[PDB]
């Protein structure tokens with residue numbers, strides 16, 4: 001599924017992301033825009049052989065099992081393919097664990113590079129929330 005802006009923001013808000021660990025809704029929507037372009041089916045292979053999955057590009061070295069990343073942990077305890085679902089529940093559950101891990105949203109390279117310190121409210125302007 002390719003989410004619309006507002007649509008995604010509403011689903012994220014409904015799953016408890018607004019202000020989760022102090023990151024307002026703008027942040028998560030901005031991170032999704034730049035990580036996946038709002039596409040739940042996005043995958044990207046890294047040179048280390050691991051792969052990023054889904055709307056939040058969650059990585060197979062630590063967070064999910066894809067059965068082709070040697071020496072990987074499955075910290076969110078799901079197959080990676082569950083991350084590519086229409087239903088963002090599993091991505092959101094896993095993200096909440098990634099974001100509590102001590103680094104915050106700096107775990108996502110596109111957030112750090114493209115969202116961090118920008119006006120993130122704009123990603124939630126004009127949306128019925």
Ligand SMILES: [Cl-]
Pocket residue numbers: 021099102103104105
């Ligand atoms: Cl944090």
Ligand code: NA
Pocket residue numbers: 059060061062063064065066069072073074075
């Ligand atoms: Na893994």
